[PDB]
Amino acid sequence: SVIAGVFGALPPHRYSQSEITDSFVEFPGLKEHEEIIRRLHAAAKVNGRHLVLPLQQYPSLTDFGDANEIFIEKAVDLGVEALLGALDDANLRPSDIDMIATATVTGVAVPSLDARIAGRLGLRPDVRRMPLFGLGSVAGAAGVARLRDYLRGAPDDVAVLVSVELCSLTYPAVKPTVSSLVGTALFGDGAAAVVAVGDRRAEQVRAGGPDILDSRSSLYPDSLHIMGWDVGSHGLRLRLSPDLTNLIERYLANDVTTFLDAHRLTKDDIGAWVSHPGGPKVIDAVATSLALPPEALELTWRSLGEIGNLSSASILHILRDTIEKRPPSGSAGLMLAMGPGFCTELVLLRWR
Amino acid sequence: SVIAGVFGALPPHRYSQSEITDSFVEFPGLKEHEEIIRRLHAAAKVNGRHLVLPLQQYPSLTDFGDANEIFIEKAVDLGVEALLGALDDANLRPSDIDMIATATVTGVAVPSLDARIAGRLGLRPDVRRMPLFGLGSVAGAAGVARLRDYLRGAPDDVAVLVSVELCSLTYPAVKPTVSSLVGTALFGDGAAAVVAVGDRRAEQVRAGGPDILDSRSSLYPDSLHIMGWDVGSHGLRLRLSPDLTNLIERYLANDVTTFLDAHRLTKDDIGAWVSHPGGPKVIDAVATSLALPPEALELTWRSLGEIGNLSSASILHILRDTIEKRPPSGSAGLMLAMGPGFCTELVLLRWR
Ligand SMILES: CC(C)(COP(=O)(O)OP(=O)(O)OC[C@H]1O[C@@H](n2cnc3c(N)ncnc32)[C@H](O)[C@@H]1OP(=O)(O)O)[C@@H](O)C(=O)NCCC(=O)NCCS
Ligand SMILES: CCCCCCCCCCCCCCCC(=O)O
Ligand SMILES: CCCCCCCCCCCCCCCC(=O)O
């Protein structure tokens, strides 16, 4: 399997972090809590975010059911955008696609978003669908891996991943908890989309983007409370534990070594790191765990500062940032994600 | 890919269609519509269903969050039950599984169920997890078809599908409107797992089940409203068009014909039919359009009568029934499911 295109899309409204935070302490009911808000919004190392709605409008998003309706509607719009983008990048057409997968965690669609996306693009009635849901922040790297798995049974085939994540819209569930506030500091809105072709298909089509050689999942024992949704009348409420960072610190070198020893490669063999931006404490703990020098990760940081945490979408935006800055050809690349599980996923790549 | 193990798990308490009606007509807010209730409950051709919760508890099950957490607790239980049974039947062990696909439309689990089930039975930490939401009633055929798609490219592998539908628990979204009541008369609670194995590993574990040969998805354009959920503060409220049947009548034969030709076969080279029991009106419509004899779909008719509509999991029950009845060796079976999309999935099989 060979990546033929990468494209991200973002909502038209962008605000600076402090615009956001300025309006946000003035929100219904947050003014008792304004200091820990500013403190966290400020250590978050996000410089702006995209919002699928005008900033003005968020305090009137207290109904879950309205929020999710708007999610359906907005989410397709943007997934359609990034897929047109990647297919252009991949010089291809929707008629071409033999498998679509969608990944989200910030809304509940039925029919699922791929259904809606195929409907919109005039995808071939027989397209195989794969609506991945509860995967979270890991689904960017897991999606690429699921695609690879596909194009391994179906060489001559074309597969897309689309990821929409509209983290703003989850706002009916925000309370002034530390964990809700943390994500209030971190999350933004955006989509991304990855076209990839099986090995037979890559020549004919001229596939640009890199090879997808392998992936490994790593699921942690008794770690469900690390990341999750408390789902209810309020919608989708963050569970996000402090323990997350020290797990990484403790178990992450080993996921990497086990996955790279099967290739007889070392950390030193990675030409480019493609790593999910959990936010400052998560990037550090990565960088510390595998002891990377500040530049292996500069593009993940530069993504987090620019657009904030786009959940599963961020790792693909960032993948796109690396493909462009055009790495040492025939070198190795490692995608690295984690989400609800708790799990990690690693994706082995080789540039052109 | 070759099935090795199928298994349905089911909530301990079975209730009569009649005692379920006679209790349901006394539920807070229902006695006024007793008459339509009786009429839809008798009209449905379902003689008993299992419920996850005792019957008399459902009137108190008014909060989505309470329902959603009850779901997660019980769905895991029931899913690992299904799974372990399939494994046994395949004679394999939780550790041998190299990817678990997971299937629900009935609860919102993050971490996902596959995540949870995998901790429960201890699958390897690097099991490949494939969490499907939003395929709903088509998921039983859909999931078996992505099992093959996986195993095509992994001939030594083991992949499992685990379906769990706990329709009951949607009760907080239930109000006495017609589509909703139609729901209270068909849907029951249960779980199926399939254990599949790839082509070279079939020879080894000596895989008993049907060989999985092919799949055709078929997504009907502009039918996103025929069925799915209006998701809200109140939970998962069913959307179901009275138009659904009519589209099966119209568009099914061609879907079946286009697929068996590709294969050089006929409606009548089919050894056994495994159909989704969506409604007697559905089943008729399917038999009507395919101009099948009454025997073709008897196990479906009986599965409906015996444990209700179990959304995705129903077909996998009917598929275990079918295996059990042993259709003529080396003949061809056909899986046929329908659901939110609107779509159909066909799965071509070959019985031992
Ligand atoms: C309802 C059922 C039990 C049979 O019902 P029945 O009482 O013999 O006859 P009908 O289907 O005509 O239903 C009676 C009335 O309810 C209406 N109705 C039936 N299903 C309806 C729905 N899903 N939404 C709205 N109205 C519906 C009918 O239009 C009819 O109304 P009318 O008398 O006002 O014109 C059932 O078999 C059915 O029709 N369901 C469809 C199956 C389905 O959709 N599959 C589920 C997905 S797995
Ligand atoms: C401005 C609104 C953002 C504040 C609310 C944060 C909502 C996003 C939190 C979920 C992030 C998605 C992935 C994280 C883990 C998960 O729950 O799956
Ligand atoms: C006392 C018993 C009540 C039983 C449940 C009544 C409401 C059932 C709602 C069923 C929804 C079925 C959804 C799945 C199939 C689909 O969406 O594909």
Swiss-Prot record, chains A, B:
InterPro entries: Chalcone/stilbene_synt_C, Chalcone/stilbene_synt_N, Polyketide_synthase_type-III, Thiolase-like. Substrate binds at residues 179, 240, 276-281, 311. Pathway: Lipid metabolism; fatty acid biosynthesis. The active site is at 137 (nucleophile). One of its GO terms (biological process) is polyketide biosynthetic process. Its EC number is 2.3.1.-. Pfam families: Chal_sti_synt_C, Chal_sti_synt_N. Belongs to the thiolase-like superfamily. Chalcone/stilbene synthases family. This is Methyl-branched alkylpyrone synthesis polyketide synthase-like Pks11. It comes from Mycobacterium tuberculosis (strain CDC 1551 / Oshkosh).
